[PDB]
């Protein structure tokens, strides 16, 4: 959605320059049915030794995210047995997120598929250290165990 | 900032290796056909390549006078999502353009080096797509090898 | 959302100038409803004649 | 006149059935033929038209063929 | 063209290209180089001409 | 089978940041009142209009889709056009 200060910003990305300007925004929905009166910070730096101009746009409650810290090899299993597609009762109904949780995975539109080998590929992670990322795993872990 | 430095940093690190493949190719291209000595006899000195638009049946009768057709082995990619052969680059031949002029043929004849440079860019950055030298007689020779 | 006519009810989820457009065209000539027009060029479009 | 048809006409009946080429050289291989208005695919042939001048057997039966008026 | 270089020739044709060379990048292996999972669902990278 | 298409499309929001909104609607020769109040500490609206089998002032709808459209007019936007870089 076009403001006139984000014509500005554009001019000024063009140019090739760096910057960065916070402003209320109107963010359309990803649904394409409402508007927000957001806040957003456009932060840009040029791509050097190229023609394009790299922005990363950031809410202000954006400036934090939690990173887990699950190193104990017991925790993440303590948290994992919870997500089998058989503990339908004790918990809620879940879904996994189509993410590159690493490379053994392979993303699928049958999202039981997906929650199933993710359960298999925690199974066996310990091996798996220079394989897969621990960031999204355990980061994904921690959540199934707060909710 | 740092995560638009690191990002713009990373992708202008992209770029410049695809520069790079880009220079290797062009070198080798220009220094080849430089040493290239004209003709207008492939009876004898056959200019063996693929021809992309070829019927996978094993029909010998699908070559032509002047040339040897391939019949390359197709193994599946799922980086490209199709069937990929790195053993050699597949040539495309308008179907306006006649594939056994002599024009034709010495382009044919002087472009195999550039298989040769093809695989050895690759080689070196195994994420690499289509890297393609788009003759100026029509010709199109991408490096791997698919119909 | 809903309505109590017990008939909106039923169209339950519909914009609501689809159904009594007086109304909101007022209400946004009030300004309690400002609205943007935006293209999106890169949408898939029925073959018309 | 089927002597000097010859002399005026011997060989300059052909013609390629892609009009772009004119040369037996360069009339072989494949090409698009728009002029169907469909678009489709043909093989490039150098050919003779059917009545020629190449011979003397030749301009003496595509010169009877003028005299009798049909496809003159 | 750089058949005549050096040996200076007549350059009949020498002004001319032999072609393009040209080596695709594709649009996921950049989303992969600005990763957005660190970030909230709002925020996001976008680059520009 | 389907092509691309430019489709004008349109969403509303709360303009304002007050809470009560009242009047009477000037419908074609009649009148229909309302209060339209918005629930605090929530997106919602609470219109109160009383009237209803009154006369018809749905002369034309708000359709907020995806209408099919043409584009800006490109004869205007090339007298000014957006900054660009050569
Ligand atoms: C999209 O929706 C936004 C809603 O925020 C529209 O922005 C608003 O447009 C109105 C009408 O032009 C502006 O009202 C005028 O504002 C000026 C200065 O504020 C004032 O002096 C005038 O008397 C008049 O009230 C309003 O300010 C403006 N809001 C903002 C934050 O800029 C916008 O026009 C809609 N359309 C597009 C294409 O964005
Ligand atoms: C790059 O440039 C060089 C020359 O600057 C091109 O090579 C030359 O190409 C012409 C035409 O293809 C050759 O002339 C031909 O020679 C044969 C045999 O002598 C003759 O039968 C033909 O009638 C015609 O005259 C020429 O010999 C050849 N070499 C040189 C030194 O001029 C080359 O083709 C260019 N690159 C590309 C991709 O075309
Ligand atoms: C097989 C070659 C062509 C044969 C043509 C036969 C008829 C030629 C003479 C026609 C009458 C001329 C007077
Ligand atoms: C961000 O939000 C706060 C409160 O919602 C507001 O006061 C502030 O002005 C906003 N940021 C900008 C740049 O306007
Ligand atoms: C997806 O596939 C799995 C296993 O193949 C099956 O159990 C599930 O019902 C499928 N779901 C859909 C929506 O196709
Ligand atoms: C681009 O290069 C300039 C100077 O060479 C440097 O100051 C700047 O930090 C660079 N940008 C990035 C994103 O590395
Ligand atoms: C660039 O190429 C080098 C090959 O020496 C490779 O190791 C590196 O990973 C490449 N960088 C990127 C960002 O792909
Ligand atoms: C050109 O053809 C000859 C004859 O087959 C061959 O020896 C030569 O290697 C070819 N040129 C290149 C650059 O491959
Ligand atoms: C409100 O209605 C009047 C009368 O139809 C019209 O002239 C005007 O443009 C509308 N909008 C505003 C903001 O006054």
């Known amino acids: 959605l076009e403001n006139d200060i984000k014509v500005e910003i554009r001019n000024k990305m063009i140019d090739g320059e760096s910057g960065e300007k916070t402003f209320r925004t109107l963010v359309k929905s990803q649904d394409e049915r409402y508007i927000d009166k957001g806040n957003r910070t456009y932060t840009w730096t040029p791509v050097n030794g190229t023609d394009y101009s790299l922005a990363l746009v950031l809410p202000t409650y954006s400036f934090y995210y939690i990173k887990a810290k699950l190193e104990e090899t017991i925790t993440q299993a303590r948290y994992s047995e919870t997500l089998k597609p058989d503990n339908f009762e004790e918990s809620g109904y879940t879904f996994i997120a189509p993410r590159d949780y690493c490379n053994d995975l392979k993303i699928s539109d049958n999202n039981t598929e997906f929650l199933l080998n993710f359960n298999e590929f925690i199974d066996r992670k310990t091996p798996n250290n220079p394989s897969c990322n621990a960031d999204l795993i355990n980061r994904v872990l921690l959540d199934a165990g707060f909710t | ?65 002047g040339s040897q057709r391939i019949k390359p082995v197709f193994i599946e990619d799922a980086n490209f999502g199709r069937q990929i052969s790195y053993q050699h680059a597949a040539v495309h031949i308008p179907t306006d353009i006649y594939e056994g002029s002599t024009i034709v043929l010495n382009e044919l004849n002087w472009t195999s080096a550039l298989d040769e440079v093809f695989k050895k860019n690759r080689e070196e950055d195994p994420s690499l797509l289509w890297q393609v030298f788009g003759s100026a007689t029509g010709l199109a020779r991408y490096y791997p090898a698919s119909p | 959302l809903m309505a109590n006519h017990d008939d909106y009810t039923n169209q339950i989820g519909r914009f609501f100038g689809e159904i009594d457009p007086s109304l909101m065209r007022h209400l946004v000539n009030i300004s309690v409803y400002a609205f943007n027009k935006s293209y999106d060029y890169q949408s898939v479009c029925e073959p018309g004649a | 006149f089927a002597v000097i048809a010859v002399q005026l006409f011997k060989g300059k009946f052909f013609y390629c059935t892609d009009s772009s080429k004119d040369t037996e050289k360069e009339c072989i291989g494949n090409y698009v033929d728009h002029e169907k208005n469909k678009m489709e695919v043909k093989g490039r042939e150098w050919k003779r038209h059917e009545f020629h001048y190449d011979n003397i057997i030749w301009a003496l039966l595509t010169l009877f063929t003028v005299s009798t008026g049909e496809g003159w | 063209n750089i058949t005549g270089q050096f040996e200076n020739k007549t350059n009949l044709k020498n002004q001319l290209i032999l072609g393009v060379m040209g080596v695709d990048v594709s649009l996921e292996d950049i989303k992969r180089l600005t990763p957005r999972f660190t970030l909230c669902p709002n925020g996001y990278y976008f680059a520009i001409d | 089978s389907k092509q691309s298409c430019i ?74 056009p957006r900054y660009r870089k050569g």
Request: proline share 4%; hydrophobic share 35%; glycine share 4%.
């Open chain 2, 1 to 65: 900032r740092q995560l638009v430095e690191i990002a713009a940093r990373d992708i202008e690190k992209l770029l410049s290796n695809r520069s790079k493949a880009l220079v290797r190719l062009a070198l080798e291209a220009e220094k080849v056909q430089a040493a290239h000595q004209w003709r207008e006899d492939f009876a004898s000195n056959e200019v063996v390549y693929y021809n992309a638009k070829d019927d996978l049946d094993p029909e010998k009768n699908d070559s032509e006078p």
């Open chain 6, 7 to 80: 489709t004008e499309q349109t969403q509303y929001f709360f303009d304002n940041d007050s809470k009560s909104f009242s009047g009477v609607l000037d419908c074609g020769n009649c009148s229909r009142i309302f209060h339209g109040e918005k629930l605090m500490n929530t997106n919602l609206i609470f219109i109160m209009v009383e009237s209803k089998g009154t006369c018809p002032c749905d002369t034309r709808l708000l359709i907020q889709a995806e209408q099919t459209s043409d584009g800006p007019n490109p004869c205007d936007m090339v007298k000014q």
